[PDB]
Design a protein around this nucleic acid. Sequence first.
DNA 1: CTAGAACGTGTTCTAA
DNA 2: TTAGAACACGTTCTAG
Lengths: 184, 183
Amino acid sequence: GSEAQRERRKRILDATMAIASKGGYEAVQMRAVADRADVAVGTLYRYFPSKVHLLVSALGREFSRIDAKTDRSAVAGATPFQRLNFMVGKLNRAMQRNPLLTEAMTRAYVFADASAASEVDQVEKLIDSMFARAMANGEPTEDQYHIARVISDVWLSNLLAWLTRRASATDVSKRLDLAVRLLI
Amino acid sequence: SEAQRERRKRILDATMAIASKGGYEAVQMRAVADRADVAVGTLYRYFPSKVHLLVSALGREFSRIDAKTDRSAVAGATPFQRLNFMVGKLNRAMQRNPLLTEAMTRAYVFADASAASEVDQVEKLIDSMFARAMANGEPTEDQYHIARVISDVWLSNLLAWLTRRASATDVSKRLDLAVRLLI
DNA sequence: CTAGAACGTGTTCTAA
DNA sequence: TTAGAACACGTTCTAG
């Protein structure tokens, strides 16, 4: 709605990501987010009705932005195979840039119940679409969207393994390009 | 001890019974302890977090399913069939009790590194049930990798069902589609 | 909106 | 082991 309100929302989401960067999920505490966005906690709950909604919107907003910084690059490589490997890689890297910030958003994303479905949906759609439109070098086909979904599922699984120290960054890229190749 | 094992089983049974009737929110540590006739400190001795607890319950249940499905999963004439079969068996198992499935799955995906060993066991029981269904025995390396991809598609879809973002039909169709793209 | 008190549940502590 | 009080943080409530 109003300019001030769009400005409060952004301030709340910048706080959340600043805090998550230094402390992960356990440090994204609602008094701390509020305090640092200079709002009372009741105002915080007016804008985001749970810690999880808050984090899934922060993750929604970060992917929207990556989606912008990704339009020429994603459509750079000369074959679908290559454009996909490239997009997977840029996204993998973006996530590895701040493990604790990634950790907070990703766990909220998979933990979210049905009351957050609409926020969880946007993030899943954005990710599917970044992959599809890179693979297809523009508007994807039906087959290319379905392939893109499978690759987002593989990505998420591997990201969760990387976060829980069950897999290294090497294991993750090996499993990802393994999946890409089996579907192209 | 037989005491230690009797008490471990009472606690996981408590956990699943409560999860059935109420899902994740209702798996409360005071309630579980009470139901298993143990004090909370004893509960935390066996399982150091609500999430360790629920991810061990999930471990024991895939473990159990694993035995229940040793002949049948290797019944279909082709890899394609055996995989589709295994996928459907596991799907129908999860769908049997949505709130039980909700509680265990959310812990499974919420778990941090402090439960990495419980999470790991569950991931590998599932990977292996799929691979061995595909293969009808010890899988090749290529069957194992395909198994992994399909467990990832499976989990993603199970979360979307749980969050009412996909129906049971939407999920069947996405699994089918993945099993085709890979066989 | 603001500042916080109050309350529930996961986790830890104290005491027998 | 037990019983249960204490404490922290997500969430809701009371007041101004």
